[PDB]
Amino acid sequence: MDEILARAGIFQGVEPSAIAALTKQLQPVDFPRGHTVFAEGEPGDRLYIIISGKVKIGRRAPDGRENLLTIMGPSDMFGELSIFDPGPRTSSATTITEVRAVSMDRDALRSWIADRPEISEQLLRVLARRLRRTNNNLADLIFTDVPGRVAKQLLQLAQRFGTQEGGALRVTHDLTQEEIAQLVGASRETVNKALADFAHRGWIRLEGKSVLISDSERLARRAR
Amino acid sequence: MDEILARAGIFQGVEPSAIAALTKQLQPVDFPRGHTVFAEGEPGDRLYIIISGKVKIGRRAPDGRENLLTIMGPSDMFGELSIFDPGPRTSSATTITEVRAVSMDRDALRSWIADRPEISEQLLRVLARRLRRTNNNLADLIFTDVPGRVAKQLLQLAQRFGTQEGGALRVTHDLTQEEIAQLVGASRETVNKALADFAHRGWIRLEGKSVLISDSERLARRAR
Ligand SMILES: Nc1ncnc2c1ncn2[C@@H]1O[C@@H]2COP(=O)(O)O[C@H]2[C@H]1O
Ligand SMILES: Nc1ncnc2c1ncn2[C@@H]1O[C@@H]2COP(=O)(O)O[C@H]2[C@H]1O
């Protein structure tokens, strides 16, 4: 599991042999599927790295309507925004499978950067990347229509969690039909038809909390 | 000049007798109104701090339509994202006034960070905060009604540019009709209907490029 940790935004760029010498006394946590690790708006000082399982990053309207910002998995950090720009959690963080993680608090995190200055530019790198992704997600809402947007999401899910079957990519995305619409940021029926059409043409084939992508090249053409 | 450069964000962590050191190294520049500093897509080795003027950071749709990510004024840093996660600019940076600014580049920047790790700690704060704002705008798009957004937007312009002018607020945003629209991520058509509604509910008034705000509460209610 040290192997999964070493793939972090933090542990990337700290001498790999020395990554052993530091991974010791962190608090390692467990969560059942469905656990609110923390809620949007509340204070918090902990940052987590996912050892195993997937966490969904949610945003909730006063109205009661839900929205998913991104899905995190093995090796992804979450809960760092309220640390770096001190303030409240910018969103809810909810487990999607059972989840093994490892957390560290604000001060523990201070030791780390002081002793291993390299971390900061990787941390900078993660937020910058996330900015880029979010910038895109945002423009997609102003500009891209639903099936176009579903295409992007499956594709993004696939670069992040996809495995190979041969020519085709497996995407065990551990999601419900409503969470997928929630990532896409549009109606549930509408996301399902967009998905049905793509299945129709054997571009994708749906199976449980999972999708198999046959024809990524056309898929990527519905994106745009 | 140097006290606007002191409130930059990069610099909120260095000795008073150091900002001067880092200020020499910097390269003064004077862009005219309607100048493109760089454009979404170009390579980027260079980051900017606006001494004065305002600049719009923008993204263009395939349809030729354009959403404005933010407006930037004295002390603001921009073009940092291609330093931390090297790649193209995610967005264009175009003046909406004459501008005098100050630039520094990837190697200059990296040298400073090895010299003074505090700079890292500060750009994380800046990035995280940028990411916090964007989650709010993004979610405004799924969750918040169309003039509902024009509220939060005017006030935010205010928070950042608002001058108390006889019990009211003086915001010289320097945005044309369309430019305000693009911040809200909408068509002039439905935006200028919030021009007219706030014109005969008398909370503002279109004076020059500027705008004078006389309300506050029937906005923080009108937004939330
Ligand atoms: N736009 C985004 N892209 C990627 N991750 C995000 C985004 N918004 C929030 N998160 C993550 O979800 C976390 C919720 O808690 P924090 O706001 O402390 O830190 C946040 C980030 O780690
Ligand atoms: N969401 C955002 N909020 C504020 N500024 C941004 C945002 N997205 C991009 N930018 C700025 O726009 C700049 C364009 O050039 P870079 O991508 O190098 O760096 C980018 C950031 O400085």
Which residues on chain B are in Cβ contact (under 8 Å) with A121? 84, 113, 120
> Does A160 share its domain with A193?
yes
Is B184 annotated among the ligand-binding residues? yes
Residue A60 Cα, gap to closest chain B Cα (Å): 9
Q: Which of B144, B161, B192 is the last residue of a domain?
A: B144
Q: Are residues A117 and A11 in the same domain?
A: yes
Asked if B200 and B139 sit in the same domain, the reply is: no
Residue A77 and residue A125 in one domain: yes
A23 burial type by CB count under 10 A (0-12 exposed, 13-18 middle, 19+ buried): middle
- Interval between CA A59 and ligand 1 midpoint (Å): 10
- Cα–Cα distance measured from residue A189 to residue A63, given in angstroms and rounded to the nearest whole number: 20
For chain B, what is the largest distance between any 2 Cα atoms, rounded to a whole number of angstroms?
57
d(CA B177, CA B191): 9
Based on C-alpha coordinates, what's the Rg of chain A?
Answer: 18
Contact in structure between A110 and B109 (CB atoms under 8 Å):
no
- Boundary-marking domain end, from A116, A144, A172: A144
Neighboring chain A residues of B129 at a CB cutoff of 8 Å: 85
**Ligand 1 in reach of A134 Cβ (< 6 A):** yes
Nearest Cα neighbor of A135 from B212, B135, B127 is B135
How far apart are the CA of A128 and the nearest CA of chain B, in angstroms?
6
Q: Which residues contact A97 (CB under 8 A, 6 or more apart)?
A: A33, A53, A54, A174
Same domain, B129 and B156: no
> What's the structural domain count of chain A?
2
Q: Where are the alpha helices (DSSP H) in chain B?
A: 16-24, 81-84, 106-115, 118-143, 146-161, 177-184, 188-191, 193-197, 217-223
d(CA A223, CA A141): 13
Resolution for the entry shown, Å: 2.6
Burial class (CB in 10 A: 0-12, 13-18, 19+), A39: middle
Residues B111 and B209 in one domain: no
CATH number of the domain enclosing B174: 1.10.10.10
Q: Give the domain-ending residue among B90, B118, B144.
A: B144
Residues B74 and B172 in one domain: no
Q: Alpha-carbon distance A34 to A31, whole Å?
A: 8
Query: Which residues have C-beta within 8 Å of that of residue A101, sequence separation ≥ 6?
Result: A28, A29, A30, A31, A37, A48, A49, A50, A51
What does DSSP assign to residue B147?
H
Query: Nearest-CA distance from B184 to chain A in Å?
Result: 10
- Per DSSP, the residues of chain A read -HHHHHTSTTTTTS-TTTTTTTSSS-EEEEE-TT-EEE-TTS---EEEEEEES-EEEEEE-TTS-EEEEEEE-TT-EES-HHHHTTSS-SSEEEESS-EEEEEEEHHHHHHHHHH-THHHHHHHHHHHHHHHHHHHHHHHHHH--HHHHHHHHHHHHHHHHEEEEESEEEE-----HHHHHHHHTS-HHHHHHHHHHHHHTTSEEE-SS-EEES-HHHHHHHH-
Angstrom CA distances, A59 to A56, A82, A90, B93, stand at 10, 15, 8, 29
Tell me which residues of chain A have a C-beta less than 8 Å from any C-beta of chain B: 59, 61-63, 65, 67, 69, 80-81, 83-87, 90-91, 113-114, 117, 120-121, 123-125, 127-132, 134-135, 137-139, 141-143, 185, 224
Gap between the Cα atoms of B71 and B94, Å rounded: 10
Question: What three-state secondary structure class fits B116?
Answer: coil
> Whole domain around residue A158: which residue ranges?
145-224
| CA–CA distance, B13 with B36 (Å, rounded to integer) | 31
DSSP B204: -
| B185 neighbourhood in chain A, CB within 8 Å | 138, 141-142
